[PDB]
């Protein structure tokens, strides 16, 4: 079930096409498990969300194979030199909510949503992937074996408190801020405790760093996500409400 082989980085797949991939002594005792992790996290199907299309366990050798988008991820494109336009953006913001939405409605919390796990296809759409295996807990293991900028506060120096469908939409305000900025934010200073404990006080990215322009209503969205009362903050079926009509209407 869902077994490739080496025989079948980059990698033209021998029969199925393009696909990327992702690569210690084998222990029998983990691999039944391993295969049926891949198996649920195969069962995650939407436009806007990365197919995990297959696995490689063999001997001493596990691998993970999810399919290709070209422009890579979203802070490549926003840092490129050809300007990406509003409707654009607009169009990635609805696709976001949209694969958030999804992933939500089938009981998945991404917990690590960031612009390096926002996908970009050649056309500009997007895909929401999970690069940092969050929600693979078995094959997180083998990764380790011998950026907390969008990290929502009530996480920050509490490691105990279980993550929410209201974490990821804090991630999405930063994410938001970030496609206007066309950059990281908080200057790109190292993650420190200084920083930490300033944005558990209350500090958030910096509206008026934005120099483009920001419709009135995508800088509320985003005020009203990063909310430190994690209660305050919308849903995604909720964000989805407001915002199809408004890219509609104004950014398409
Ligand atoms: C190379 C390379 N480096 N990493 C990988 N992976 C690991 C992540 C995998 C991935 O994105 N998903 N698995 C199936 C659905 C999707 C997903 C998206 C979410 F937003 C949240 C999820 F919980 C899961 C793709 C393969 O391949």
């Given at each position: 079930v869902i077994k490739m082989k080496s025989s079948d980085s980059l990698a033209f797949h021998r029969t199925q096409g393009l696909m990327i991939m992702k690569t210690g002594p084998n222990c029998i005792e983990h691999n039944e498990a391993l295969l049926e992790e891949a198996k649920m996290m195969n069962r995650l199907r939407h436009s806007r969300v990365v197919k995990l299309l297959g696995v490689i366990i063999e001997?001493?050798?596990?691998?993970?194979?999810?399919?290709?988008?070209?422009?890579?991820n979203?802070?490549?494109?926003?840092?490129?030199?050809?300007?990406?336009?509003?409707?654009?953006?607009?169009?990635?913001?609805?696709?976001?909510?949209?694969?958030?939405?999804?992933?939500?409605?089938?009981?998945?919390?991404?917990?690590?949503?960031?612009?390096?796990?926002?996908?970009?296809?050649?056309?500009f759409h997007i895909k929401i992937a999970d690069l940092g295996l969050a929600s693979f807990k078995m094959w997180s293991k083998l990764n380790n074996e011998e950026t907390l900028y969008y990290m929502a506060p009530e996480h920050l120096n509490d490691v105990n408190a279980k993550?929410?469908?209201?974490?990821?939409?804090?991630?999405f305000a930063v994410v938001l801020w970030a496609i206007f900025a066309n950059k990281e934010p908080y200057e790109n200073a190292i993650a420190e405790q200084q920083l930490i404990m300033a944005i558990?006080?209350?500090?958030?990215?910096?509206?008026?760093?934005?120099?483009?322009?920001?419709?009135?209503?995508?800088?509320?969205?985003?005020?009203?996500?990063?909310?430190?009362?994690?209660?305050?903050?919308?849903?995604?079926?909720?964000?989805?409400?407001?915002?199809?009509?408004?890219?509609?209407?104004?950014?398409?």
């Open positions: 001997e001493g050798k596990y691998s993970l194979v999810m399919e290709y988008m070209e422009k890579g979203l802070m490549h494109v926003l840092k490129a030199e050809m300007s990406t336009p509003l409707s654009v953006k607009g169009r990635i913001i609805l696709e976001i909510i949209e694969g958030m939405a999804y992933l939500h409605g089938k009981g998945v919390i991404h917990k690590d949503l960031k612009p390096e796990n926002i996908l970009v296809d050649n056309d993550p929410t469908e209201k974490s990821d939409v804090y991630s558990k006080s209350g500090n958030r990215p910096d509206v008026d760093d934005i120099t483009e322009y920001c419709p009135r209503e995508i800088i509320s969205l985003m005020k009203l996500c990063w909310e430190a009362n994690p209660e305050a903050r919308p849903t995604f079926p909720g964000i989805e409400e407001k915002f199809r009509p408004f890219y509609l209407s104004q950014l398409e």
